[PDB]
Amino acid sequence: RARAFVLETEEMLDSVDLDYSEAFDGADALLHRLKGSIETIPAHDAQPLLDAAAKLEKKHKLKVPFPSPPPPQNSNYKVSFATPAQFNVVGSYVAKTMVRTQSAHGIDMIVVLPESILQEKDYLDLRYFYKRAYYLAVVAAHLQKDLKGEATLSYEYHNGNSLLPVLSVKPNGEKDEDEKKKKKGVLDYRIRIIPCAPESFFPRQKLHLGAGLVRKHKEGEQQANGQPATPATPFYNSTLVAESSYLQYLKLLRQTEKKCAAFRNACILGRIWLQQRGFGSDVSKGGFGYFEWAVLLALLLQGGPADTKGAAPLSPSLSSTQLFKALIQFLSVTNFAEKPCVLGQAKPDLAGFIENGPILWDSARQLNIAFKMGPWSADLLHQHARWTRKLLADGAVDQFQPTFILKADLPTHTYDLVARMDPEKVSEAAPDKVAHEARGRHWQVGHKVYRILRRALSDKNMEGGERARLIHLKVSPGFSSSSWSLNEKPQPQKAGTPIEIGVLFDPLNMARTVDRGPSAGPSAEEKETCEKFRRFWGEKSELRRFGGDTIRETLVWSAQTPFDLCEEIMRYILGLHLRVGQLQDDIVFYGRSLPALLSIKPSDTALFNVARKTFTSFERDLRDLEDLPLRIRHVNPICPELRHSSLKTPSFGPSKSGPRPMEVVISFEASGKWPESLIAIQRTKIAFLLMIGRLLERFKPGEIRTHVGLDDARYETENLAFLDVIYASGACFRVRIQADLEESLLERQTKDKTTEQYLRQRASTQLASFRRTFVHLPLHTQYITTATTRFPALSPTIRLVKHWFSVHKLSNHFPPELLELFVLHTFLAPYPWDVPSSPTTGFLRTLLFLARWDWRTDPLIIDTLDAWRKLDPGMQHTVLFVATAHEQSGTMWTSVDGHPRPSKVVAARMTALAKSAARVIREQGVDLDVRRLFVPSLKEYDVLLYLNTKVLKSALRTYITVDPATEMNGGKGQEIKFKNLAPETVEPPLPVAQHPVDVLLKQLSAVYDSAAGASGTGPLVFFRSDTTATEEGDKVIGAVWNPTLVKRKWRVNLPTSYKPV
Amino acid sequence: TASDFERLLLGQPDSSELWIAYMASQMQVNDLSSARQIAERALKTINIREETEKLNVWIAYLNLEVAYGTDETVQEVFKRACTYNDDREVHERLASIYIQSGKYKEAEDLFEKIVKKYGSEAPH
Amino acid sequence: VHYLYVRRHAPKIPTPTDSRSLFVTNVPVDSTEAHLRALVTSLVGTGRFEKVTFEDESKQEHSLEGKSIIDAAQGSTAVVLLADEKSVEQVLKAIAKVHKTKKYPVWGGDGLPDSKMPPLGPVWLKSHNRLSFPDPSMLQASVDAFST
């Protein structure tokens, strides 16, 4: 792991490395010439507000006073301009850490005001920031005069801070070795001038976050034991002290460079970490970037642990590999993601971890490093750092290439909303009073909706366990421009503010009906009567009895089909507490196959009920208590109806459905009286099964009926007969007999027939198909029935992906467990994404991973090759490779069916439709027009044939228990029943209500292929015609001609339809 | 460095203090698996009669299993350490280790275990 | 139109059960004893038809192989058996002149149209009947007759 990470950090270094002639002289030229002009600037007199306005209206350039601008009745001071006194480079360029980032990067350029312009109280009430804006305005006007009008310029904000307005210059052209600087869109893209303050002029101890530095009330803000009365403004205080202390930070950072020059690749890897994790130094993205990463790395060089011993993986004689492992470990575990908001703080040198206070404190300066960061971004970093911890903690699979993207902040549940708080007193329930204007640094609505939805969706159990339906939250201010032009003072917006709510859900308690609270008080406690409960709820406060004899303040939600109770939560509480700004969620994927039971749609109970409860009562205990010449050894259910993979969560009755007959392997004890011939072994299996059947019919559950039918799933085995048991509640169960000498004799049949020299391929396919039928399905279903308790999105995710492959017509050749392990690849090894807390998110994850996987060099390994790739370089026999610890061969569910594999077949089409899915989701978005995903194109087909079924209306959907076809009235209630389908004869008319094209295309999957190969909606395994025989699909076959048959010679081993030429 | 450590080990193989120095460098480079590898290398290649060096490697590995390990690994190494060394002494070392680490509840469970098992002959 | 090829199976028959047959290639869809007796009686001057053995069709519906290609315990070509020598020679001189009626001087439209047996509802649905509901008396009798 370690040497691989070293060499992979080196390859990314030589890939994102730089050019020396680019750096010097391309940046150096403009740096020197801009400093020349900024020193040829002249200084003006100390002028008041009226002179400032009087020149600012007449000149083209405007000031940047943030709201609110100071009036002349509140402004008694004077503002001046003076000659700049200093020059330094800051950020990443003075440290030489910069990398070629394809979008942009900005080199920040300090200029510091002289000390004679300021007054010792100017850190009170917005004065110094007004002088700062005026200094910037004069620098602006005179640089417009001395550039002779050739370079363009815009107004911006530094790090998204609305209290630091800045200017960023943009070029337009490129020559060889002149001024102009366009082609370097990383280093020479942006030169952001920053106005700052000198060092140690304002009292930092009063610049502490807990002191309120905006005085608005003067009546009653005393006699309260110090200063809790004047409320603390941490964003404003921290911003002021950071603007005055930009300098000695870079001094300390340069010190850390020359004490360890591994800082280069250190913050290179940290910067690519942040750029891929989608954050930044912008306050909209959390305000965590290269600067914070560097200064946290520095203080963790000079300490960090509790006993102030040095950070053990951070001695100055290490490399960037272990340095980045150290930072991801510390950011995950000690006090640097969410713990610096809930349970502790850090110190600067000598650095320590103490168990109090939300702050990233530095002491000699009195500054929070995490002032732009909230608890939202905190828990986000905690998740990301835990993921990186386990990804660099594993030691079998390479994890340098996977880098995390925020599926938690961009889920499928993009609840867009339009909230127009104009006017504020009538369209916002929280009063944005002058106190709120002082506290919030123009992010009041953000903090408000953060707290509102977090307390809205958090629950509280009875044992004190703080369990919620959410773990993360972030508001993304879409259409928030940080750049504006030269003729306007603020950044105004006329289209309102869009508020995006991206929540990573908790699937263990997502779909729970009950919302929980505190003990329903004898006297109403403040927790019962706060802004989290009965007042905050209103009409949904009630009293509900538990299963544990305590009675608490509770809620009762609804469990429904097309959307979620969390969607109901957010709609109702948003409309109540922010305002009536509307909510819509129209991403339709919950319209799956809808099972016909009580309370549509039933949650994870119906599959359980029918399969498991009818399995227990009654056939299993009865079959184990029968008397027989041979005793049974195991009764293990191996179906999707147990393992949560069935396309239809089954009901009581549906003998017309595909996956309703439940296949289970049965076996008897070790007995040597089985014969040595396969036909004889299968006939003794039949005879034993007939004894079981007669006793099952003669005992008192004789309302169950049995029958012994033949099977044709295997080739060259025509004597296989089962017992499908028809339970009194309409369940179906196919039993099969597995024998050790049966396995060894079929290995012998694969062994012999050496003379003809051309039988070993078909012998191998029949052997592997037989092993698939009998051996490994036990271990598969035990593993996934174990995994379903920790991953609850699995069965609806499998239903979505198998529905997509069904409407695209490929699962006739694709086995269902192939699709199962393909989705468990996105589930159980979820890197580089989060856990799928929605079935929709899981479906999109499989779709995008299948869009970004190639079958040519990358195999699929999932934690639930070099002898095959060499003999198959063009891979005409095998396209996929899915190997586990359960199967290390990787060819067990892939090449046993005999999938044709040129570039003009099922597999390449599968690849192409996944690509087109990724294209359309990337291009137009997620809207109502997504259903081009679920309609098929029917292109690239040589001959097309439409078929029609001889059924009456609402057939077969009503007996496959799915509820489209409004023409059958009552599909949303309980009108359909199957105890009348429970038949009187086993002949027609019981199997006449089945669908014929399924087994027609089994014969049309039983003879040709050497002529042609087709795929239709029929033989789609464990799926009937219904959802593709409604409007959502159609009954078609599309037959393509293989490229191997164009024209050939007259043979006898021809098989095809050839004509004379 | 690891090559320096291997050179000083081929110079002095029985040297438990250098063994713990090498695995402690592996703690500083966070490779606890290679630290286990080094500890078992000490347990094999440290010679038969050097009981004090063996118990030094043992109690260091117990420090690892209480500090960075988990319950199952600390109990299996406790079993192996009493299987190959003195039960009373490895129990008292884990007790003082619990005293140092502050894990006082499981410390109390170990104390009642050792006054049950070895209160018959130890007054200490 | 469907083309049917006819060559002599006579120069490679050492087995007595393959006596006096015809090597057919590309038998049409659902080619059975009924389609064969219909075509041999529609050919004029022809003897008697008995049996098609080795009727494992390998074309007219999709998949990798056929159904009975390997003896599991230990090419769509059929073996059409006729009455005797005279019936074989008559069907040879009849299929020869049919292959010449491809270019017959009135028109080539005098060729025989091959009427299919289309899979009707229940007639095909006996496939569902044999996968799930066969006759237990016959199944019991067969399994006891072998297991005895």
UniProtKB/TrEMBL annotation, chain A:
Q: Give the Nrap protein domain ranges.
A: 107-259, 262-407, 412-578, 602-787, 791-936, 938-1061
Q: Which GO terms describe its molecular function?
A: RNA binding
Q: Which UniProt keywords apply?
A: Nucleus, Ribonucleoprotein, Ribosome biogenesis, RNA-binding, rRNA processing
Q: Which GO terms describe its cellular component?
A: CURI complex; small-subunit processome; UTP-C complex
Q: Which cell locations does it reside in?
A: Nucleus, Nucleolus
Q: Which family does this protein fall into?
A: Belongs to the NRAP family.
Signal sequence annotation? none
Q: What is the official name of this protein in its record?
A: U3 small nucleolar RNA-associated protein 22
Biological-process GO terms, alphabetical: rRNA processing; tRNA export from nucleus
Q: Known Pfam families for this protein?
A: Nrap, Nrap_D2, Nrap_D3, Nrap_D4, Nrap_D5, Nrap_D6
TrEMBL record, chain B:
Q: Where are the TPR repeats?
A: 88-121
Q: State what protein this is by name.
A: rRNA biogenesis protein RRP5
Portion of the parent chain present = 1494 to 1617 of 1796
| Cellular compartment(s) | Nucleus, Nucleolus
Function, as annotated, reads:
Involved in the biogenesis of rRNA. Required for the formation of 18S and 5.8S rRNA.
Where on the tree of life does the source sit, at the highest rank? Eukaryota
The organism of origin for this protein? Chaetomium thermophilum (strain DSM 1495 / CBS 144.50 / IMI 039719) (Thermochaetoides thermophila)
From TrEMBL, chain C:
Q: Which residues form the Rrp7 RRM-like N-terminal domain?
A: 1-110
Family, similarity comment: Belongs to the RRP7 family.
Could you tell me what this protein is called? Uncharacterized protein
Q: What is the scientific name of the source organism?
A: Chaetomium thermophilum (strain DSM 1495 / CBS 144.50 / IMI 039719) (Thermochaetoides thermophila)
Q: Which residues of the full protein are shown?
A: 30 to 218 of 322
